[PDB]
Design a protein around this ligand. Structure first.
Ligand SMILES: O=[N+]([O-])c1ccc2[nH]cnc2c1
Ligand SMILES: O=[N+]([O-])c1ccc2[nH]cnc2c1
Lengths: 470, 469
C-alpha cells in the first residue's frame, strides 16, 4: 500500500534539519517557467490530491516502515519520526497543508503561477517541500494535455481550410500509446490527459481514471472501433492476405473497421486487394461504417500521399466545396506510425499541397503522444518563494548567475486578470494591494480535504480551442 | 482492483473475430529489433508476471465490468465474454499461457528473442496477443537498465584511464529522477532498473519494488546521503547563503553531504564562500564524509571545469600515479543538471583533456535517466511468429516493402550460444535439430504460476560489465 513517507526524493528526508531555525512557514509554487509552447493546459492535480494526499495518509505502521527503510538507506538515523508523529497525533494523519490552484482545463501562458502550497501548522514547515516530488509529477498530465491540444490546433487549422468546417475534429488524433508508455499508471494518466482534447483512445486505462477522479455525464469519455493488428492479418499466411481482409471486413460489416494494410506491400494491398479484388465489399459499406485503411511503415508523408493517389484512382473521388479532393464516405485512411507534433504538421501541409482534404485522414500516435515528453518541455518547476522565520516573512528565490531562465519568483503569489483580459502573476504579496482585482487561484486542498473539484466535462470546456469557441 | 480485461489496447478486444477460423495456437515473441545500443539488459518481466499476470486474474465481476465498459466504448457488443468465462470456469481464472524468457540481468545483442508467449489451451488462441500490451511495457525497465549500463561503461573507461582502478564506480551515477517521471509506478520500475547497475538513488519507490518482487541479501539495494535543495539554501535569505552552508555542513559534519551551490553565483560560492569564508569547516572533514559541491546550472561541461579550476586553486591538489589532478579526499563535486548519456560522455572527456581525474566527480541524472526514453530506442517489439490452424503449424511474419527494418522472425524460436560463445536466435523451429546446445529461454510463467524467479543479486551479477569481470 502507498506510503507518502516513502514517496519523496531521498534528500528531502534530511531537509527538516537544514531550514533556518524557528521557521514557521514554507510557501512554494509551481509554474511552467518561461524559456513552441506558449500556453499550457492545467490538468491532473485533482488526480494527485485524491489518490495520494487526502484523508488519513499517516499511520503508526507507515511511520515505522519509513523509519526502518531510511535507517538502512542512509546508513544512519536521520528520519523525522517526531514530525510525522505530530501529524498523526494532532490531525489524525491528515496533512496540514493548503493548496491553491488555477481551475483544471484552464489554458494559461507560460511563466504564471499555477498552484501554491503552504503549511497550515508552524510545526509542519518541513511538509511543504516534502510533497514537492508528488505534486511536481503533475508536469506529466499538463504536458500531455498541452501537446495534445497543440496538435488539435494544427488539425483544426488544416481541416477548416480544406473542408470549410471542423466536423470530426475530436476524432482526428487517436491514442495508440498504451504499449509505449512506461507503466500502467502512466497509461491511465496520460490517456486521460489526451482525452481533454480528443475522444478517440485505445488506452483503456484512461476511462476508469476519469470516471473515478473527474466524472462525465456520458457513460465513457472515450471511444474506439474494431481494428486489425499485424498478427490478425499475418496469421492467415503470406499468400492469404486477401482472405484475412475479406474475413475482417465481413465480420465488421456494419461498424467502422480499421485494417492495417502494410504487412507485406501497402501499395499492392491498396491498389490490387482493396482496389480491385475486394472493391465490391468496400463500395457497399455505409457512411457510418467506413473501411479505414491503415498504412504503418515507410516515410509517413510519402506513404500517405501515395496511398491517397492509389485509392483516388480505384475509387470515385469528388471535389468538395473548397476545391479539395475527397474519397467516398465509405473509405478513409489512418496514419498511426511515426506521428508526433512535427510529422503531423508535415503530413497535413503535404496533403493540402496535393489538394487532398484533411477529411480523408485521421492520425494515431503512441510514444509521440504519451511517452516522448519530459519535464523540460514546459519547464515545469516547483520552488519556495516565501518563508516566515522568527515571525518575519521573507521573500526568497533562486537566480543562478549563468542561467537567468532559472530565476524563480519572489514572495507570496497571486494570479490576476489584466485590464486587457490577460493573465498576470503578482509577486511579493502585491495581490493584497487590490489593484488587480481578485486572485484567480482557488483553494483546492486544505488540511486533508479536497475543497474544490472539477468534472471532466468542465475541464474539456475550459480547454477548448478559440476556433471551436468561434 | 486491477482488471486484466481492461488492460489491453482497445482493438485487441475485437481480435478474436479476426484470426483464421480453426486456429488452436498463437505463438508470439519479444525482441529489441536490430536497426548504438548494440546489446540490451533483459530486466523487468518478473515484476509484470507477479503484479499483473499470476494467480486468479479473472472473476465474474471483472468480466461483467469489462462487458459494461466495452459496450459504451465501442457503442457495440463486441467482447469475447464466452472466451473469458471459459478461463474462469476451466482454470479458476488462471491464464492458460506459457512464457519462456532469457534470465533477468542477461546482456543480449540486438535482434534476439528475449521472451516468447503462447496459449496452452486451444480455446485460448486469442489470449496470447491480448496480453501483448502489458508484456510490451517491459520495454521500459529494459531500456532504463540498458541505458544506465551504457553510462556505466563510459564512466568505467574514463575512471580506469584517469585513476588506474574502478573504485566507487557503482556510486558514480545517482538517480535524481523521481520528480521527472510520469507517475509513481514508473518511478519505482525505472529506479529499480537503474539499481541493476548502480547503488545510488534518491528515487525511494525503487527500494520497495525490489524488496517485494526480486529481493536482495542486503537490507536495501540502494543508498543516499544528506543533501541540500534550493529551498534549504534560499530560505535563509539572499544575504545569508554562507549561513545556510555553514549550518548544513555543521549539521551533517560526520557523513557525506551534498550542497547545491548555484542559488545565486556558483563561482563566488566555490571561490569565496567554500574556498575562503568556510574553508576551515571543509579541510577538517573526514575522507568518509566529504563535502560534495553541487553546481546545477549553466553549460554542464563548462561549469564543471570552471568549478574544478576554482577549487584547485583554493584547496591542495595532488597528482595521481596516472598524472591526473585530484582534489583532497574531503572535497568532491557532483553534476546533476542536464546529464544524459551524451553529455556524460562530453563531461568526462572534457575533464580528461584538462587533466582532471574522474575520481573528482560524480553525476546525477533525472529525466535523462528515467523519462527521456521510448520504446523506439531499442525497437522493443512483440510479434506473432507461429500459428497452428487446422492442426498444421504455419510460420508467420510481417515484412513491409518500404521498411526491411520492420521484418519479423518466422516460426518457433529459441536462443542459443554459438561455438564462439555469442548468441544466435534460431527460427522455424530449427532449435529442435539440437545442433546448437540448449535453449537459453526458460519457462518463467505457466498456467497462472510463476515457475522460475531471479533475485536482484543474481540479476546484478548477470548484468556486470566486462571491465569489472
Ligand atoms: O487500434 N487501432 O489501430 C485503431 C483504433 C481506432 C481507430 N479509429 C480509426 N482507426 C483506428 C485504428
Ligand atoms: O539529492 N542529492 O542532491 C544527492 C543525493 C545523493 C548524493 N550522493 C552524492 N551526491 C549526492 C546528491
Amino acid at each position: 500500500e502507498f506510503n507518502i513517507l516513502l514517496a519523496t526524493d531521498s534528500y528531502k528526508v534530511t531537509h527538516y534539519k537544514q531550514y533556518p531555525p524557528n521557521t514557521s512557514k514554507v510557501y512554494s509554487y509551481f509554474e511552467c517557467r518561461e524559456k513552441k509552447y506558449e500556453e499550457t493546459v492545467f490538468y491532473g492535480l485533482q488526480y494527485i490530491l485524491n489518490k495520494y494526499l487526502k484523508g488519513k495518509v499517516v499511520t503508526k505502521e507507515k511511520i515505522q516502515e519509513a523509519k526502518d527503510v531510511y535507517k538502512e538507506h542512509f546508513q544512519d538515523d536521520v528520519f523525522n519520526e517526531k514530525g510525522w508523529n505530530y501529524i498523526l497525533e494532532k490531525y489524525d494523519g491528515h496533512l496540514p497543508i493548503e493548496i491553491k490552484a488555477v481551475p483544471e482545463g484552464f489554458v494559461i501562458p507560460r511563466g504564471n503561477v499555477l498552484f501554491t502550497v503552504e503549511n497550515t501548522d508552524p510545526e509542519c514547515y518541513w511538509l511543504t517541500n516534502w510533497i514537492e516530488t508528488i505534486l511536481v509529477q503533475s508536469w506529466y498530465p499538463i504536458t500531455v494535455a498541452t501537446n495534445s491540444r497543440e496538435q488539435k490546433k494544427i488539425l483544426a487549422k488544416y481541416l477548416l481550410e480544406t473542408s470549410g468546417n471542423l466536423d470530426g475534429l475530436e476524432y482526428k488524433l487517436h491514442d495508440f500509446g498504451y504499449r509505449g508508455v512506461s507503466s500502467q499508471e502512466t497509461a491511465g494518466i496520460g490517456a486521460s490527459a489526451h482525452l481533454v482534447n480528443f475522444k478517440g483512445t485505445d488506452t483503456v486505462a484512461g476511462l476508469a481514471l476519469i470516471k473515478k477522479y473527474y466524472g462525465t455525464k456520458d457513460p465513457v469519455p472515450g471511444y474506439s472501433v474494431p481494428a486489425a493488428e499485424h498478427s490478425t492479418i499475418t496469421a492467415w499466411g503470406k499468400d492469404h492476405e486477401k482472405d484475412a481482409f475479406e474475413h475482417i471486413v465481413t465480420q465488421f460489416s456494419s461498424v467502422p473497421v480499421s485494417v492495417v494494410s502494410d504487412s507485406y506491400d501497402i501499395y499492392n494491398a491498396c491498389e490490387k486487394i482493396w482496389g480491385e479484388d475486394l472493391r465490391h465489399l468496400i463500395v457497399s459499406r455505409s457512411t457510418q461504417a467506413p473501411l479505414i485503411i491503415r498504412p504503418d511503415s515507410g516515410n509517413p508523408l510519402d506513404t500517405v500521399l501515395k496511398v491517397l493517389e492509389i485509392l483516388g484512382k480505384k475509387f470515385p473521388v469528388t471535389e468538395n466545396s473548397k476545391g479539395y479532393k475527397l474519397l467516398p464516405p465509405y473509405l478513409r485512411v489512418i496514419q498511426g506510425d511515426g506521428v508526433d507534433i512535427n510529422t503531423l504538421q508535415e503530413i497535413v501541409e503535404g496533403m493540402k499541397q496535393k489538394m487532398w482534404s484533411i477529411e480523408n485522414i485521421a492520425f494515431g500516435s503512441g510514444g509521440g503522444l504519451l511517452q516522448k515528453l519530459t519535464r523540460d518541455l514546459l519547464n515545469c518547476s516547483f520552488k519556495c518563494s516565501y518563508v516566515v522565520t522568527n515571525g518575519l516573512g521573507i521573500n526568497v528565490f533562486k537566480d543562478p548567475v549563468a542561467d537567468p531562465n532559472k530565476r524563480s519568483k519572489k514572495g507570496r503569489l497571486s494570479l490576476h486578470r489584466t485590464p486587457a483580459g490577460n493573465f498576470v502573476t503578482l509577486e511579493e504579496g502585491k495581490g493584497d494591494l487590490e489593484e488587480y482585482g481578485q486572485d484567480l487561484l482557488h483553494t483546492v486542498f486544505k488540511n486533508g480535504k479536497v475543497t474544490k473539484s472539477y468534472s471532466f466535462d468542465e475541464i474539456r470546456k475550459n480547454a477548448q480551442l478559440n476556433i471551436e469557441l468561434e
